[PDB]
Amino acid sequence: XXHX
Amino acid sequence: PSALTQPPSASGSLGQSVTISCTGTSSDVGGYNYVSWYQQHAGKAPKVIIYEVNKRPSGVPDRFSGSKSGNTASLTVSGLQAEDEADYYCSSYEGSDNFVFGTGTKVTVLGQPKANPTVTLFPPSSEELQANKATLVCLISDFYPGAVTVAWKADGSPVKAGVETTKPSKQSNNKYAASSYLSLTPEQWKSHRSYSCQVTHEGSTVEKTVAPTECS
Amino acid sequence: PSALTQPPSASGSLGQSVTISCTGTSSDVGGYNYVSWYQQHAGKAPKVIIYEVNKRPSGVPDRFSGSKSGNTASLTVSGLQAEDEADYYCSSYEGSDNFVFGTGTKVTVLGQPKANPTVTLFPPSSEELQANKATLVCLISDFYPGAVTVAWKADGSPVKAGVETTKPSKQSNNKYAASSYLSLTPEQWKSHRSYSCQVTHEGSTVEKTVAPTECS
Protein backbone atom coordinates (compact mmCIF):
# COMPACT_ATOMS: atom_id res chain seq x y z
CA UNK A 1 0.00 0.00 0.00
CA UNK A 2 2.39 4.19 1.54
CA HIS A 3 2.79 5.93 -1.67
CA UNK A 4 2.74 5.83 -5.51
CA PRO B 1 1.64 -2.28 16.61
CA SER B 2 -1.40 -4.47 17.38
CA ALA B 3 -3.40 -1.32 16.77
CA LEU B 4 -6.31 -1.58 14.31
CA THR B 5 -9.13 -3.72 15.61
CA GLN B 6 -11.44 -5.82 13.47
CA PRO B 7 -14.24 -8.29 14.23
CA PRO B 8 -12.91 -11.81 14.65
CA SER B 9 -15.58 -13.30 12.39
CA ALA B 10 -17.92 -11.74 9.84
CA SER B 11 -20.29 -14.01 7.93
CA GLY B 12 -23.48 -14.25 5.95
CA SER B 13 -25.37 -16.36 3.45
CA LEU B 14 -25.01 -16.12 -0.33
CA GLY B 15 -26.46 -12.77 -1.40
CA GLN B 16 -26.29 -11.11 1.99
CA SER B 17 -23.87 -8.22 2.43
CA VAL B 18 -21.35 -8.25 5.28
CA THR B 19 -19.59 -5.19 6.72
CA ILE B 20 -16.11 -5.22 8.28
CA SER B 21 -14.89 -2.28 10.36
CA CYS B 22 -11.35 -1.29 11.27
CA THR B 23 -11.70 0.52 14.55
CA GLY B 24 -8.13 1.73 14.74
CA THR B 25 -6.76 2.96 18.06
CA SER B 26 -5.44 6.45 18.78
CA SER B 27 -4.41 5.97 15.19
CA ASP B 28 -2.69 8.21 12.71
CA VAL B 29 -4.55 11.42 13.33
CA GLY B 30 -4.59 14.88 11.91
CA GLY B 31 -6.55 13.60 8.93
CA TYR B 32 -5.40 10.08 8.18
CA ASN B 33 -6.31 8.54 4.85
CA TYR B 34 -4.07 5.68 3.67
CA VAL B 35 -6.38 2.93 4.84
CA SER B 36 -6.18 -0.10 2.57
CA TRP B 37 -8.12 -3.36 2.38
CA TYR B 38 -6.61 -6.78 1.75
CA GLN B 39 -8.31 -10.06 0.99
CA GLN B 40 -6.27 -13.15 1.75
CA HIS B 41 -7.36 -16.68 0.88
CA ALA B 42 -6.78 -20.30 1.73
CA GLY B 43 -2.98 -20.38 1.50
CA LYS B 44 -2.85 -17.98 -1.45
CA ALA B 45 -1.49 -14.50 -0.56
CA PRO B 46 -2.82 -11.01 0.10
CA LYS B 47 -4.58 -9.16 -2.71
CA VAL B 48 -5.33 -5.47 -2.09
CA ILE B 49 -9.01 -4.85 -2.91
CA ILE B 50 -9.48 -1.27 -1.71
CA TYR B 51 -6.91 1.49 -1.14
CA GLU B 52 -6.76 5.18 -0.29
CA VAL B 53 -9.86 4.63 1.82
CA ASN B 54 -12.50 4.14 -0.90
CA LYS B 55 -10.63 3.62 -4.18
CA ARG B 56 -10.82 0.04 -5.48
CA PRO B 57 -8.14 -1.11 -7.93
CA SER B 58 -8.75 -2.37 -11.47
CA GLY B 59 -9.89 -5.97 -11.24
CA VAL B 60 -12.02 -5.45 -8.11
CA PRO B 61 -15.80 -5.68 -8.56
CA ASP B 62 -17.78 -2.74 -7.14
CA ARG B 63 -19.39 -5.40 -4.97
CA PHE B 64 -16.65 -4.28 -2.57
CA SER B 65 -16.55 -0.82 -0.94
CA GLY B 66 -14.24 1.23 1.30
CA SER B 67 -15.14 3.84 3.97
CA LYS B 68 -14.04 5.77 7.08
CA SER B 69 -15.16 8.01 9.96
CA GLY B 70 -12.95 9.38 12.77
CA ASN B 71 -11.67 6.02 14.03
CA THR B 72 -13.50 3.27 12.08
CA ALA B 73 -12.87 2.27 8.47
CA SER B 74 -15.32 0.02 6.57
CA LEU B 75 -15.51 -2.71 3.96
CA THR B 76 -18.89 -3.76 2.55
CA VAL B 77 -19.22 -6.96 0.51
CA SER B 78 -22.48 -5.85 -1.01
CA GLY B 79 -23.81 -9.15 -2.45
CA LEU B 80 -21.95 -12.10 -0.96
CA GLN B 81 -20.63 -14.62 -3.45
CA ALA B 82 -19.09 -17.89 -2.20
CA GLU B 83 -15.62 -16.98 -3.45
CA ASP B 84 -15.73 -14.07 -1.01
CA GLU B 85 -14.95 -16.43 1.85
CA ALA B 86 -11.49 -15.47 3.16
CA ASP B 87 -9.44 -13.34 5.55
CA TYR B 88 -9.52 -9.54 5.26
CA TYR B 89 -7.01 -7.09 6.75
CA CYS B 90 -6.89 -3.29 6.89
CA SER B 91 -3.76 -1.15 6.83
CA SER B 92 -3.07 2.45 7.82
CA TYR B 93 0.25 4.12 7.04
CA GLU B 94 1.00 6.25 10.12
CA GLY B 95 4.48 7.28 9.03
CA SER B 96 7.11 5.66 6.80
CA ASP B 97 8.46 3.16 9.37
CA ASN B 98 5.08 1.98 10.58
CA PHE B 99 2.49 0.44 8.31
CA VAL B 100 -0.19 -0.75 10.77
CA PHE B 101 -2.40 -3.74 9.88
CA GLY B 102 -5.74 -4.85 11.31
CA THR B 103 -6.09 -8.21 13.07
CA GLY B 104 -7.95 -9.95 10.24
CA THR B 105 -11.61 -10.81 9.68
CA LYS B 106 -12.79 -14.22 8.49
CA VAL B 107 -15.76 -13.86 6.13
CA THR B 108 -17.86 -17.04 6.17
CA VAL B 109 -20.64 -18.06 3.78
CA LEU B 110 -22.38 -19.81 6.60
CA GLY B 111 -23.22 -23.43 5.74
CA GLN B 112 -24.50 -24.55 9.18
CA PRO B 113 -26.42 -22.65 11.88
CA LYS B 114 -24.69 -19.98 13.95
CA ALA B 115 -22.99 -20.68 17.25
CA ASN B 116 -21.63 -18.52 20.02
CA PRO B 117 -18.91 -20.03 22.20
CA THR B 118 -19.23 -21.93 25.45
CA VAL B 119 -16.63 -20.22 27.64
CA THR B 120 -15.33 -22.36 30.52
CA LEU B 121 -12.76 -20.91 32.92
CA PHE B 122 -10.55 -23.14 35.11
CA PRO B 123 -8.54 -22.07 38.15
CA PRO B 124 -5.08 -23.45 38.95
CA SER B 125 -5.65 -26.90 40.44
CA SER B 126 -4.36 -27.40 43.96
CA GLU B 127 -1.91 -30.16 43.03
CA GLU B 128 -0.51 -27.79 40.44
CA LEU B 129 -0.07 -25.13 43.12
CA GLN B 130 1.64 -27.80 45.22
CA ALA B 131 4.04 -28.11 42.28
CA ASN B 132 4.59 -24.38 42.86
CA LYS B 133 2.84 -23.63 39.58
CA ALA B 134 -0.13 -21.57 38.46
CA THR B 135 -1.84 -21.97 35.08
CA LEU B 136 -5.43 -20.95 34.28
CA VAL B 137 -7.42 -22.08 31.19
CA CYS B 138 -10.26 -20.74 28.99
CA LEU B 139 -12.00 -23.55 27.09
CA ILE B 140 -13.80 -22.13 24.05
CA SER B 141 -16.12 -24.59 22.39
CA ASP B 142 -19.06 -25.23 20.15
CA PHE B 143 -18.71 -22.12 18.02
CA TYR B 144 -19.44 -21.31 14.42
CA PRO B 145 -17.98 -19.75 12.41
CA GLY B 146 -14.43 -20.56 13.46
CA ALA B 147 -12.98 -17.15 14.40
CA VAL B 148 -12.78 -16.16 18.07
CA THR B 149 -11.18 -13.36 20.10
CA VAL B 150 -9.85 -13.93 23.62
CA ALA B 151 -8.73 -11.28 26.10
CA TRP B 152 -7.61 -11.89 29.70
CA LYS B 153 -7.91 -9.58 32.71
CA ALA B 154 -6.24 -9.22 36.10
CA ASP B 155 -9.09 -7.52 37.95
CA GLY B 156 -10.22 -6.07 34.61
CA SER B 157 -6.81 -4.79 33.65
CA PRO B 158 -5.62 -6.21 30.36
CA VAL B 159 -3.16 -9.07 30.80
CA LYS B 160 -1.07 -9.61 27.68
CA ALA B 161 1.76 -11.48 29.35
CA GLY B 162 1.48 -15.22 29.98
CA VAL B 163 -1.23 -15.60 27.37
CA GLU B 164 -1.42 -18.20 24.63
CA THR B 165 -4.47 -18.48 22.40
CA THR B 166 -4.67 -21.63 20.31
CA LYS B 167 -6.04 -21.18 16.78
CA PRO B 168 -9.49 -22.73 16.44
CA SER B 169 -9.67 -26.44 15.65
CA LYS B 170 -12.70 -28.34 14.39
CA GLN B 171 -14.58 -30.81 16.57
CA SER B 172 -16.36 -34.04 15.59
CA ASN B 173 -19.63 -32.09 15.75
CA ASN B 174 -18.34 -29.67 13.10
CA LYS B 175 -18.21 -26.69 15.46
CA TYR B 176 -14.91 -25.23 16.68
CA ALA B 177 -12.81 -25.16 19.79
CA ALA B 178 -10.06 -22.76 20.77
CA SER B 179 -8.30 -22.50 24.14
CA SER B 180 -6.46 -19.60 25.76
CA TYR B 181 -4.17 -19.91 28.78
CA LEU B 182 -2.45 -17.95 31.51
CA SER B 183 0.76 -19.20 33.13
CA LEU B 184 1.69 -17.41 36.34
CA THR B 185 3.26 -17.64 39.77
CA PRO B 186 1.12 -18.63 42.73
CA GLU B 187 2.08 -15.19 44.07
CA GLN B 188 0.71 -13.69 40.88
CA TRP B 189 -2.59 -15.57 41.15
CA LYS B 190 -3.11 -15.04 44.88
CA SER B 191 -2.50 -11.27 44.77
CA HIS B 192 -5.46 -10.30 42.59
CA ARG B 193 -9.14 -10.44 43.57
CA SER B 194 -10.25 -11.94 40.24
CA TYR B 195 -9.03 -13.00 36.79
CA SER B 196 -11.34 -12.88 33.76
CA CYS B 197 -11.39 -14.42 30.28
CA GLN B 198 -13.45 -12.52 27.66
CA VAL B 199 -14.25 -13.83 24.16
CA THR B 200 -15.90 -11.90 21.35
CA HIS B 201 -17.77 -13.80 18.67
CA GLU B 202 -19.80 -11.86 16.13
CA GLY B 203 -21.39 -9.33 18.45
CA SER B 204 -21.57 -11.70 21.41
CA THR B 205 -18.96 -11.15 24.14
CA VAL B 206 -18.82 -13.60 27.05
CA GLU B 207 -16.66 -12.87 30.08
CA LYS B 208 -16.02 -15.47 32.74
CA THR B 209 -14.38 -14.29 35.97
CA VAL B 210 -12.65 -16.42 38.61
CA ALA B 211 -11.12 -15.76 42.06
CA PRO B 212 -8.23 -17.19 44.08
CA THR B 213 -9.06 -19.44 47.06
CA GLU B 214 -6.77 -21.72 49.08
CA CYS B 215 -6.64 -24.72 51.48
CA SER B 216 -3.65 -25.84 49.48
CA PRO C 1 -1.16 -13.48 -15.97
CA SER C 2 0.95 -12.19 -13.16
CA ALA C 3 2.09 -11.61 -9.63
CA LEU C 4 5.65 -11.62 -8.21
CA THR C 5 7.23 -15.06 -8.20
CA GLN C 6 8.61 -16.61 -5.03
CA PRO C 7 10.12 -19.99 -4.13
CA PRO C 8 7.61 -21.75 -1.94
CA SER C 9 10.00 -22.65 0.86
CA ALA C 10 13.42 -21.86 2.24
CA SER C 11 15.29 -23.94 4.83
CA GLY C 12 17.90 -22.43 7.17
CA SER C 13 19.63 -23.38 10.42
CA LEU C 14 19.94 -21.52 13.72
CA GLY C 15 22.20 -18.51 13.20
CA GLN C 16 23.20 -19.10 9.54
CA SER C 17 21.50 -17.04 6.81
CA VAL C 18 18.80 -17.58 4.22
CA THR C 19 17.94 -15.35 1.26
CA ILE C 20 14.41 -15.28 -0.14
CA SER C 21 14.28 -14.10 -3.75
CA CYS C 22 11.16 -12.41 -5.16
CA THR C 23 11.26 -12.01 -8.95
CA GLY C 24 9.31 -9.63 -11.15
CA THR C 25 9.28 -8.02 -14.59
CA SER C 26 10.44 -4.70 -16.08
CA SER C 27 6.94 -3.39 -15.38
CA ASP C 28 7.17 -3.77 -11.59
CA VAL C 29 10.13 -5.24 -9.66
CA GLY C 30 12.96 -3.22 -11.22
CA GLY C 31 11.16 -0.35 -12.93
CA TYR C 32 10.35 1.30 -9.62
CA ASN C 33 12.14 1.09 -6.28
CA TYR C 34 9.03 0.04 -4.30
CA VAL C 35 9.58 -3.57 -3.33
CA SER C 36 8.62 -4.54 0.22
CA TRP C 37 8.53 -7.59 2.47
CA TYR C 38 6.16 -9.08 5.01
CA GLN C 39 6.70 -11.63 7.80
CA GLN C 40 3.43 -13.55 8.29
CA HIS C 41 3.16 -16.16 11.00
CA ALA C 42 0.80 -19.11 10.80
CA GLY C 43 -2.61 -17.58 10.18
CA LYS C 44 -1.85 -14.27 11.89
CA ALA C 45 -1.43 -10.67 10.72
CA PRO C 46 1.45 -9.73 8.39
CA LYS C 47 4.26 -7.44 9.57
CA VAL C 48 6.02 -5.10 7.11
CA ILE C 49 9.68 -5.89 7.73
CA ILE C 50 11.08 -3.99 4.67
CA TYR C 51 9.53 -1.19 2.59
CA GLU C 52 11.68 0.23 -0.21
CA VAL C 53 14.23 -2.23 -1.53
CA ASN C 54 16.08 -2.09 1.80
CA LYS C 55 14.87 0.02 4.65
CA ARG C 56 13.62 -1.64 7.82
CA PRO C 57 10.99 -0.53 10.24
CA SER C 58 12.36 0.94 13.44
CA GLY C 59 11.42 -2.16 15.36
CA VAL C 60 12.47 -4.96 13.03
CA PRO C 61 15.26 -7.27 14.19
CA ASP C 62 18.63 -8.75 13.34
CA ARG C 63 19.40 -9.52 9.69
CA PHE C 64 16.30 -8.39 7.88
CA SER C 65 17.84 -6.83 4.78
CA GLY C 66 17.01 -6.48 1.09
CA SER C 67 18.95 -6.43 -2.16
CA LYS C 68 17.22 -5.46 -5.38
CA SER C 69 19.52 -7.19 -7.82
CA GLY C 70 17.96 -6.24 -11.13
CA ASN C 71 14.55 -7.86 -11.45
CA THR C 72 15.45 -10.01 -8.46
CA ALA C 73 14.58 -8.78 -4.99
CA SER C 74 16.27 -10.69 -2.18
CA LEU C 75 15.43 -10.71 1.49
CA THR C 76 18.51 -11.69 3.40
CA VAL C 77 17.72 -13.15 6.77
CA SER C 78 20.72 -13.92 8.92
CA GLY C 79 21.08 -14.59 12.64
CA LEU C 80 18.49 -17.32 12.39
CA GLN C 81 16.12 -17.46 15.32
CA ALA C 82 13.26 -19.98 15.58
CA GLU C 83 10.85 -17.07 15.86
CA ASP C 84 11.41 -16.42 12.14
CA GLU C 85 9.43 -19.40 10.85
CA ALA C 86 6.66 -17.82 8.83
CA ASP C 87 5.41 -17.16 5.34
CA TYR C 88 7.20 -14.30 3.59
CA TYR C 89 5.58 -11.99 1.11
CA CYS C 90 7.09 -9.39 -1.21
CA SER C 91 5.43 -6.67 -3.22
CA SER C 92 5.97 -4.24 -6.04
CA TYR C 93 4.35 -1.08 -7.26
CA GLU C 94 3.16 -1.50 -10.86
CA GLY C 95 1.64 1.81 -11.91
CA SER C 96 -1.78 3.43 -11.81
CA ASP C 97 -1.82 2.97 -8.05
CA ASN C 98 -1.61 -0.87 -8.06
CA PHE C 99 0.59 -3.30 -6.07
CA VAL C 100 1.49 -6.93 -6.82
CA PHE C 101 2.31 -9.61 -4.26
CA GLY C 102 4.62 -12.62 -4.32
CA THR C 103 3.63 -16.29 -4.18
CA GLY C 104 5.15 -16.50 -0.69
CA THR C 105 7.80 -18.62 1.00
CA LYS C 106 7.60 -20.83 4.11
CA VAL C 107 10.93 -20.29 5.83
CA THR C 108 11.60 -23.26 8.09
CA VAL C 109 14.50 -23.13 10.54
CA LEU C 110 16.32 -26.36 11.27
CA GLY C 111 18.17 -27.53 14.36
CA GLN C 112 15.50 -26.43 16.87
CA PRO C 113 15.39 -28.72 19.89
CA LYS C 114 12.64 -31.16 20.77
CA ALA C 115 10.52 -30.35 23.80
CA ASN C 116 8.39 -32.93 25.61
CA PRO C 117 5.09 -31.30 26.48
CA THR C 118 3.92 -30.10 29.89
CA VAL C 119 0.57 -31.74 30.66
CA THR C 120 -1.88 -29.93 32.91
CA LEU C 121 -5.10 -31.82 33.66
CA PHE C 122 -7.98 -29.71 34.97
CA PRO C 123 -10.97 -31.02 36.91
CA PRO C 124 -14.41 -29.41 36.57
CA SER C 125 -14.75 -26.06 38.28
CA SER C 126 -17.09 -25.84 41.24
CA GLU C 127 -19.50 -23.65 39.27
CA GLU C 128 -19.57 -25.68 36.05
CA LEU C 129 -20.63 -28.24 38.57
CA GLN C 130 -23.19 -25.88 40.15
CA ALA C 131 -24.79 -25.72 36.74
CA ASN C 132 -24.83 -29.47 36.18
CA LYS C 133 -22.18 -29.82 33.44
CA ALA C 134 -18.61 -31.02 34.00
CA THR C 135 -15.88 -30.90 31.38
CA LEU C 136 -12.21 -31.67 32.05
CA VAL C 137 -9.51 -29.91 30.01
CA CYS C 138 -6.15 -31.58 29.36
CA LEU C 139 -3.70 -28.85 28.37
CA ILE C 140 -0.63 -30.08 26.47
CA SER C 141 1.86 -27.24 26.04
CA ASP C 142 5.35 -26.04 25.18
CA PHE C 143 6.19 -28.93 22.84
CA TYR C 144 8.37 -29.30 19.77
CA PRO C 145 7.77 -30.57 17.16
CA GLY C 146 4.05 -29.95 16.91
CA ALA C 147 2.83 -33.56 16.83
CA VAL C 148 1.22 -35.31 19.79
CA THR C 149 -1.42 -37.92 20.61
CA VAL C 150 -3.96 -37.51 23.44
CA ALA C 151 -5.80 -40.37 25.17
CA TRP C 152 -8.28 -40.45 28.10
CA LYS C 153 -8.81 -43.15 30.74
CA ALA C 154 -11.97 -43.47 32.84
CA ASP C 155 -9.67 -45.09 35.35
CA GLY C 156 -7.89 -48.12 33.92
CA SER C 157 -10.10 -48.65 30.86
CA PRO C 158 -9.96 -46.04 28.10
CA VAL C 159 -12.42 -43.34 27.14
CA LYS C 160 -12.65 -43.16 23.35
CA ALA C 161 -15.87 -41.10 23.39
CA GLY C 162 -16.85 -37.53 24.33
CA VAL C 163 -13.31 -36.36 23.63
CA GLU C 164 -12.52 -33.24 21.61
CA THR C 165 -8.92 -32.37 20.85
CA THR C 166 -7.62 -29.09 19.44
CA LYS C 167 -4.45 -30.09 17.57
CA PRO C 168 -1.28 -28.07 17.69
CA SER C 169 -0.81 -24.30 17.49
CA LYS C 170 2.35 -22.18 17.37
CA GLN C 171 3.08 -20.48 20.70
CA SER C 172 5.18 -17.34 20.86
CA ASN C 173 8.24 -19.56 21.42
CA ASN C 174 8.20 -21.67 18.25
CA LYS C 175 6.59 -24.30 20.46
CA TYR C 176 3.15 -25.85 20.21
CA ALA C 177 0.06 -25.86 22.35
CA ALA C 178 -2.84 -28.31 22.09
CA SER C 179 -5.69 -29.33 24.39
CA SER C 180 -8.34 -32.03 24.67
CA TYR C 181 -11.57 -31.99 26.65
CA LEU C 182 -13.96 -34.60 28.02
CA SER C 183 -17.54 -33.54 28.80
CA LEU C 184 -18.71 -35.51 31.83
CA THR C 185 -21.82 -35.13 33.92
CA PRO C 186 -21.05 -34.62 37.62
CA GLU C 187 -22.74 -38.03 37.71
CA GLN C 188 -20.07 -39.68 35.58
CA TRP C 189 -17.47 -37.53 37.28
CA LYS C 190 -18.11 -38.90 40.73
CA SER C 191 -18.82 -42.42 39.48
CA HIS C 192 -15.05 -42.95 38.93
CA ARG C 193 -11.75 -43.20 40.79
CA SER C 194 -9.76 -41.07 38.39
CA TYR C 195 -9.76 -39.62 34.90
CA SER C 196 -6.37 -39.63 33.20
CA CYS C 197 -5.19 -37.82 30.09
CA GLN C 198 -2.34 -39.36 28.10
CA VAL C 199 -0.03 -37.43 25.80
CA THR C 200 2.44 -39.16 23.51
CA HIS C 201 5.26 -37.05 22.09
CA GLU C 202 8.07 -38.54 19.97
CA GLY C 203 7.70 -41.89 21.75
CA SER C 204 7.48 -40.35 25.22
CA THR C 205 4.27 -40.87 27.14
CA VAL C 206 3.07 -38.55 29.87
CA GLU C 207 -0.06 -39.50 31.75
CA LYS C 208 -1.67 -37.03 34.13
CA THR C 209 -4.49 -38.43 36.26
CA VAL C 210 -6.98 -36.51 38.37
CA ALA C 211 -9.19 -37.67 41.20
CA PRO C 212 -11.97 -35.70 42.89
CA THR C 213 -9.87 -33.88 45.51
CA GLU C 214 -8.68 -30.32 45.01
CA CYS C 215 -9.50 -27.10 46.82
CA SER C 216 -10.17 -24.63 43.98
Short mmCIF file of C-alpha atoms in Angstrom, two decimals, chain B:
data_model
loop_
_atom_site.label_atom_id
_atom_site.label_comp_id
_atom_site.label_asym_id
_atom_site.label_seq_id
_atom_site.Cartn_x
_atom_site.Cartn_y
_atom_site.Cartn_z
CA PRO B 1 1.64 -2.28 16.61
CA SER B 2 -1.40 -4.47 17.38
CA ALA B 3 -3.40 -1.32 16.77
CA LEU B 4 -6.31 -1.58 14.31
CA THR B 5 -9.13 -3.72 15.61
CA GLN B 6 -11.44 -5.82 13.47
CA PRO B 7 -14.24 -8.29 14.23
CA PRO B 8 -12.91 -11.81 14.65
CA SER B 9 -15.58 -13.30 12.39
CA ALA B 10 -17.92 -11.74 9.84
CA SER B 11 -20.29 -14.01 7.93
CA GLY B 12 -23.48 -14.25 5.95
CA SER B 13 -25.37 -16.36 3.45
CA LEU B 14 -25.01 -16.12 -0.33
CA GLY B 15 -26.46 -12.77 -1.40
CA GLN B 16 -26.29 -11.11 1.99
CA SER B 17 -23.87 -8.22 2.43
CA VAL B 18 -21.35 -8.25 5.28
CA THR B 19 -19.59 -5.19 6.72
CA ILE B 20 -16.11 -5.22 8.28
CA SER B 21 -14.89 -2.28 10.36
CA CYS B 22 -11.35 -1.29 11.27
CA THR B 23 -11.70 0.52 14.55
CA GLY B 24 -8.13 1.73 14.74
CA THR B 25 -6.76 2.96 18.06
CA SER B 26 -5.44 6.45 18.78
CA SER B 27 -4.41 5.97 15.19
CA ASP B 28 -2.69 8.21 12.71
CA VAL B 29 -4.55 11.42 13.33
CA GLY B 30 -4.59 14.88 11.91
CA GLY B 31 -6.55 13.60 8.93
CA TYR B 32 -5.40 10.08 8.18
CA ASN B 33 -6.31 8.54 4.85
CA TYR B 34 -4.07 5.68 3.67
CA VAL B 35 -6.38 2.93 4.84
CA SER B 36 -6.18 -0.10 2.57
CA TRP B 37 -8.12 -3.36 2.38
CA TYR B 38 -6.61 -6.78 1.75
CA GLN B 39 -8.31 -10.06 0.99
CA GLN B 40 -6.27 -13.15 1.75
CA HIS B 41 -7.36 -16.68 0.88
CA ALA B 42 -6.78 -20.30 1.73
CA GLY B 43 -2.98 -20.38 1.50
CA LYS B 44 -2.85 -17.98 -1.45
CA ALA B 45 -1.49 -14.50 -0.56
CA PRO B 46 -2.82 -11.01 0.10
CA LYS B 47 -4.58 -9.16 -2.71
CA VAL B 48 -5.33 -5.47 -2.09
CA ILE B 49 -9.01 -4.85 -2.91
CA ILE B 50 -9.48 -1.27 -1.71
CA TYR B 51 -6.91 1.49 -1.14
CA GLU B 52 -6.76 5.18 -0.29
CA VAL B 53 -9.86 4.63 1.82
CA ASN B 54 -12.50 4.14 -0.90
CA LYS B 55 -10.63 3.62 -4.18
CA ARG B 56 -10.82 0.04 -5.48
CA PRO B 57 -8.14 -1.11 -7.93
CA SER B 58 -8.75 -2.37 -11.47
CA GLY B 59 -9.89 -5.97 -11.24
CA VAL B 60 -12.02 -5.45 -8.11
CA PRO B 61 -15.80 -5.68 -8.56
CA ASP B 62 -17.78 -2.74 -7.14
CA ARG B 63 -19.39 -5.40 -4.97
CA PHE B 64 -16.65 -4.28 -2.57
CA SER B 65 -16.55 -0.82 -0.94
CA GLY B 66 -14.24 1.23 1.30
CA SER B 67 -15.14 3.84 3.97
CA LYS B 68 -14.04 5.77 7.08
CA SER B 69 -15.16 8.01 9.96
CA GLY B 70 -12.95 9.38 12.77
CA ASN B 71 -11.67 6.02 14.03
CA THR B 72 -13.50 3.27 12.08
CA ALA B 73 -12.87 2.27 8.47
CA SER B 74 -15.32 0.02 6.57
CA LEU B 75 -15.51 -2.71 3.96
CA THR B 76 -18.89 -3.76 2.55
CA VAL B 77 -19.22 -6.96 0.51
CA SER B 78 -22.48 -5.85 -1.01
CA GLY B 79 -23.81 -9.15 -2.45
CA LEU B 80 -21.95 -12.10 -0.96
CA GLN B 81 -20.63 -14.62 -3.45
CA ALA B 82 -19.09 -17.89 -2.20
CA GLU B 83 -15.62 -16.98 -3.45
CA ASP B 84 -15.73 -14.07 -1.01
CA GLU B 85 -14.95 -16.43 1.85
CA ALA B 86 -11.49 -15.47 3.16
CA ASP B 87 -9.44 -13.34 5.55
CA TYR B 88 -9.52 -9.54 5.26
CA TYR B 89 -7.01 -7.09 6.75
CA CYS B 90 -6.89 -3.29 6.89
CA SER B 91 -3.76 -1.15 6.83
CA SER B 92 -3.07 2.45 7.82
CA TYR B 93 0.25 4.12 7.04
CA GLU B 94 1.00 6.25 10.12
CA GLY B 95 4.48 7.28 9.03
CA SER B 96 7.11 5.66 6.80
CA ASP B 97 8.46 3.16 9.37
CA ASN B 98 5.08 1.98 10.58
CA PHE B 99 2.49 0.44 8.31
CA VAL B 100 -0.19 -0.75 10.77
CA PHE B 101 -2.40 -3.74 9.88
CA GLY B 102 -5.74 -4.85 11.31
CA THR B 103 -6.09 -8.21 13.07
CA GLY B 104 -7.95 -9.95 10.24
CA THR B 105 -11.61 -10.81 9.68
CA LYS B 106 -12.79 -14.22 8.49
CA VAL B 107 -15.76 -13.86 6.13
CA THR B 108 -17.86 -17.04 6.17
CA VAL B 109 -20.64 -18.06 3.78
CA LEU B 110 -22.38 -19.81 6.60
CA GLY B 111 -23.22 -23.43 5.74
CA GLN B 112 -24.50 -24.55 9.18
CA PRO B 113 -26.42 -22.65 11.88
CA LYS B 114 -24.69 -19.98 13.95
CA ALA B 115 -22.99 -20.68 17.25
CA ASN B 116 -21.63 -18.52 20.02
CA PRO B 117 -18.91 -20.03 22.20
CA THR B 118 -19.23 -21.93 25.45
CA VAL B 119 -16.63 -20.22 27.64
CA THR B 120 -15.33 -22.36 30.52
CA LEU B 121 -12.76 -20.91 32.92
CA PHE B 122 -10.55 -23.14 35.11
CA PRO B 123 -8.54 -22.07 38.15
CA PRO B 124 -5.08 -23.45 38.95
CA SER B 125 -5.65 -26.90 40.44
CA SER B 126 -4.36 -27.40 43.96
CA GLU B 127 -1.91 -30.16 43.03
CA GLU B 128 -0.51 -27.79 40.44
CA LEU B 129 -0.07 -25.13 43.12
CA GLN B 130 1.64 -27.80 45.22
CA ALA B 131 4.04 -28.11 42.28
CA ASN B 132 4.59 -24.38 42.86
CA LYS B 133 2.84 -23.63 39.58
CA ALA B 134 -0.13 -21.57 38.46
CA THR B 135 -1.84 -21.97 35.08
CA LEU B 136 -5.43 -20.95 34.28
CA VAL B 137 -7.42 -22.08 31.19
CA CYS B 138 -10.26 -20.74 28.99
CA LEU B 139 -12.00 -23.55 27.09
CA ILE B 140 -13.80 -22.13 24.05
CA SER B 141 -16.12 -24.59 22.39
CA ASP B 142 -19.06 -25.23 20.15
CA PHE B 143 -18.71 -22.12 18.02
CA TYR B 144 -19.44 -21.31 14.42
CA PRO B 145 -17.98 -19.75 12.41
CA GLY B 146 -14.43 -20.56 13.46
CA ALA B 147 -12.98 -17.15 14.40
CA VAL B 148 -12.78 -16.16 18.07
CA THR B 149 -11.18 -13.36 20.10
CA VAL B 150 -9.85 -13.93 23.62
CA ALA B 151 -8.73 -11.28 26.10
CA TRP B 152 -7.61 -11.89 29.70
CA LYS B 153 -7.91 -9.58 32.71
CA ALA B 154 -6.24 -9.22 36.10
CA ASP B 155 -9.09 -7.52 37.95
CA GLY B 156 -10.22 -6.07 34.61
CA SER B 157 -6.81 -4.79 33.65
CA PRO B 158 -5.62 -6.21 30.36
CA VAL B 159 -3.16 -9.07 30.80
CA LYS B 160 -1.07 -9.61 27.68
CA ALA B 161 1.76 -11.48 29.35
CA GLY B 162 1.48 -15.22 29.98
CA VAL B 163 -1.23 -15.60 27.37
CA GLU B 164 -1.42 -18.20 24.63
CA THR B 165 -4.47 -18.48 22.40
CA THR B 166 -4.67 -21.63 20.31
CA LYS B 167 -6.04 -21.18 16.78
CA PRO B 168 -9.49 -22.73 16.44
CA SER B 169 -9.67 -26.44 15.65
CA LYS B 170 -12.70 -28.34 14.39
CA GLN B 171 -14.58 -30.81 16.57
CA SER B 172 -16.36 -34.04 15.59
CA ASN B 173 -19.63 -32.09 15.75
CA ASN B 174 -18.34 -29.67 13.10
CA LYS B 175 -18.21 -26.69 15.46
CA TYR B 176 -14.91 -25.23 16.68
CA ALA B 177 -12.81 -25.16 19.79
CA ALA B 178 -10.06 -22.76 20.77
CA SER B 179 -8.30 -22.50 24.14
CA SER B 180 -6.46 -19.60 25.76
CA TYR B 181 -4.17 -19.91 28.78
CA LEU B 182 -2.45 -17.95 31.51
CA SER B 183 0.76 -19.20 33.13
CA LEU B 184 1.69 -17.41 36.34
CA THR B 185 3.26 -17.64 39.77
CA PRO B 186 1.12 -18.63 42.73
CA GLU B 187 2.08 -15.19 44.07
CA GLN B 188 0.71 -13.69 40.88
CA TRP B 189 -2.59 -15.57 41.15
CA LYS B 190 -3.11 -15.04 44.88
CA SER B 191 -2.50 -11.27 44.77
CA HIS B 192 -5.46 -10.30 42.59
CA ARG B 193 -9.14 -10.44 43.57
CA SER B 194 -10.25 -11.94 40.24
CA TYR B 195 -9.03 -13.00 36.79
CA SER B 196 -11.34 -12.88 33.76
CA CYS B 197 -11.39 -14.42 30.28
CA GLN B 198 -13.45 -12.52 27.66
CA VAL B 199 -14.25 -13.83 24.16
CA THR B 200 -15.90 -11.90 21.35
CA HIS B 201 -17.77 -13.80 18.67
CA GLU B 202 -19.80 -11.86 16.13
CA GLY B 203 -21.39 -9.33 18.45
CA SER B 204 -21.57 -11.70 21.41
CA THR B 205 -18.96 -11.15 24.14
CA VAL B 206 -18.82 -13.60 27.05
CA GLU B 207 -16.66 -12.87 30.08
CA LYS B 208 -16.02 -15.47 32.74
CA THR B 209 -14.38 -14.29 35.97
CA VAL B 210 -12.65 -16.42 38.61
CA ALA B 211 -11.12 -15.76 42.06
CA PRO B 212 -8.23 -17.19 44.08
CA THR B 213 -9.06 -19.44 47.06
CA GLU B 214 -6.77 -21.72 49.08
CA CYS B 215 -6.64 -24.72 51.48
CA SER B 216 -3.65 -25.84 49.48
#
